[PDB]
Amino acid sequence: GVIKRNWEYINKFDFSVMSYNILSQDLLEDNSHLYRHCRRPVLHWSFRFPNILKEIKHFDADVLCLQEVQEDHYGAEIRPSLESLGYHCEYKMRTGRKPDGCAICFKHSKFSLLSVNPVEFFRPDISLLDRDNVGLVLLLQPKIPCPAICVANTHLLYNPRRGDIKLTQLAMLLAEISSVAHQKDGSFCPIVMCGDFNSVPGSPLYSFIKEGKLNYEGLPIGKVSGQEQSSRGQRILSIPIWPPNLGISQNCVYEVQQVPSSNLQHHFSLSSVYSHYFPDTGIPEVTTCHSRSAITVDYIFYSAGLKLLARLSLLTEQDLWTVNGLPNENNSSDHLPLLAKFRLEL
Ligand SMILES: Nc1ncnc2c1ncn2[C@@H]1O[C@H](CO)[C@@H](O)[C@H]1O
Ligand SMILES: [K+]
Ligand SMILES: [K+]
Ligand SMILES: [K+]
Ligand SMILES: [Mg+2]
């Protein structure tokens, strides 16, 4: 019963991607009921950050996609530490009362920056989109003597009930990617989309990402994410989910608004790095474990044209409770870092 995270291995450019919700100290302390299982000393930022930095240093990924990156801590400690490791860092803070956000970092030696494309999901003119969540999309040029790579990162709305907002937020991210990744030959460049989607494998939202299609007629708003909730007394998704003045089509691309079928679509071909279930046993993988939750909500998606060489295996709920849950004295987030090795064949 050994508890280990192994590397599963499945004219080129090779690069590794890490997706990691590092847990904002402010979000930690605002929700202390989630960490009742934890010994008090392991929760302090002074304890947690060195461990998190050690992980990042150890894995030495070419691209970092981080969530719950607290602004004050980012400026003071996280960004300087990452810059020292040879990373160029781009940040997008949430737009509300919560001063955390997403960062996409990449090694100077591996890429040049073509464009930075932040996405704010908050729209003051649209009542539906009243949440502070954000995304970030970079276009990177691999440094070799080659096509660009589009890297996206997000942290979608947590609230389990509001699947209408989740899907609209996702649509806004997909729309940005569609714009940035478009090439002169009319196809999309290779895409890596990381983040905390607050949605479980096999959920409608997850299915939408994988299939590029969703029939959402008669679907309760709470069922979208597959997060734990009653589902009683929930309203059904509207057709359309979001209003025309968002300027995004049902194919999740920007469109020219004109002065004035319940199926969502996107034009990408996306695979998930992780299978979500252990092959031998069929036990589900988890990416987050605390007092109230043990689920997968973190993903690395990629265009399948990249080839996945390897991934760092996840753990079961039972495995994580053997080490008394997350965070603990050895692992300093309530999430596990996702890690993938990719190959771009030229
Ligand atoms: N919030 C929790 N959820 C699930 N299991 C827990 C929780 N807190 C402690 N445990 C574990 O459950 C068992 C309780 O005896 C122990 O193995 C302990 O680590
Ligand atoms: K929040
Ligand atoms: K409702
Ligand atoms: K235990
Ligand atoms: Mg969290």
Swiss-Prot record:
GO terms for biological process: 3'-UTR-mediated mRNA stabilization; mitochondrial mRNA 3'-end processing; negative regulation of mitotic cell cycle. GO terms for molecular function: catalytic activity; mRNA 3'-UTR binding. GO terms for cellular component: Cajal body; cytoplasm; mitochondrial matrix; mitochondrion. Signal peptide: none annotated. Coiled coil: none annotated. Belongs to the CCR4/nocturin family. This is Protein angel homolog 2. It comes from Homo sapiens (Human). The lineage of its organism: Eukaryota, Metazoa, Chordata, Craniata, Vertebrata. The chain holds residues 129 to 544 of 544 of the full protein.
